[PDB]
Design a protein around this nucleic acid. Sequence first.
DNA 1: GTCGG
DNA 2: GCTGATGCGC
DNA 3: CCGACCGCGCATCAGC
Length: 326
Amino acid sequence: TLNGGITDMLTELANFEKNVSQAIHKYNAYRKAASVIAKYPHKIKSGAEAKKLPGVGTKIAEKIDEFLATGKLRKLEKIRQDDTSSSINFLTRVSGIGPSAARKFVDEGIKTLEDLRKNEDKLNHHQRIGLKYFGDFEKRIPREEMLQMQDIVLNEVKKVDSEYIATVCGSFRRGAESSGDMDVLLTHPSFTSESTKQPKLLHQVVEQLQKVHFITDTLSKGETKFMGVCQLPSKNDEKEYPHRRIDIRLIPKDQYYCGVLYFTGSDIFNKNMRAHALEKGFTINEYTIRPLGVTGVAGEPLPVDSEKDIFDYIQWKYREPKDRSE
DNA sequence: GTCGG
DNA sequence: GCTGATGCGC
DNA sequence: CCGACCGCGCATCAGC
Ligand SMILES: Nc1nc2c(ncn2[C@H]2C[C@H](O)[C@@H](COP(=O)(O)OP(=O)(O)[C@@](F)(Cl)P(=O)(O)O)O2)c(=O)[nH]1
Ligand SMILES: [Cl-]
Ligand SMILES: [Cl-]
Ligand SMILES: [Cl-]
Ligand SMILES: [Mg+2]
Ligand code: NA
Ligand code: NA
Ligand code: NA
């Protein structure tokens, strides 16, 4: 929070480019700058000082000076005043409503939470659940609650098949004292890159979690990825906990390290690392790390036995999970 | 919007 | 039904 | 300049 003002501004600018302008590269340009500045161990004094960091160019440097001088940005002041931009930004806050759907709804006169509710008919399944738990999904999850949730998930999974291995990733694995949701990596020995020896591997876990009323809703569900809603159980007479977003990713057992690297993040860390990988002539996804031939085509998966092995291939000193929060 | 070649 | 492009989210 | 910007699972659609 050393340069909170500045990083907030860049984040607001990032969200505007993404939601309203549908300018994804500008979105990331601002996010990166916000990321690099949030990490800077000095209270920024000028745009020039900021322009020294990678990701901060002339435009952002200029904005930082305006912000430091006045304590605000005129460009953002006007963006806030604009009713169309405001409505669009708001609607994208509902899970399932992106920049396109948001702009479309606004074109129909649907601009508020009140409008969305009275128009459920115009929403697909995901958007309907996003609206249902709109308030809840805005809440942070204390680590203490993440710990209780982890205990339920691992124990329920164990009951389905002792050979299952569920690992909580995301910011939780990064040591955060609060998380925006729960990310669960799942593996089973019967599912590898070589073959699937048993079907419904993900389904059974989902099924079991619904049986005990932990999983309450489903946003989307496939053979290897579940996106849904869960809730901790509350005691007698006590207010029940808010509903939480939960994602479960089933990855081939022999590709765990690439999988846990991916799911631990952060997203920007993944983007930076995968970009660096490319520079070093490699390509990384949640399954493997492969070399890039002269042509530019991915070769065969390289051997991996730890997260560190991935970092070594691209000549990066190993970074613990707690230091990947970019 | 920023960067490297 | 399929394939592929697009939206959306991780 | 100017091209590059990470990589992919699921839901949905158009075109066949
Ligand atoms: N490669 C890649 N990985 C991504 C991307 N987005 C997410 N991931 C990976 C890396 C992410 O760590 C992981 C989980 O996605 P979240 O839950 O959205 O991210 P988080 O858990 O870190 C969080 F801090 Cl935003 P919290 O949920 O606590 O508020 O998915 C992306 O664009 N690209
Ligand atoms: Cl763009
Ligand atoms: Cl691996
Ligand atoms: Cl792969
Ligand atoms: Mg998360
Ligand atoms: Na710079
Ligand atoms: Na959204
Ligand atoms: Na998540």
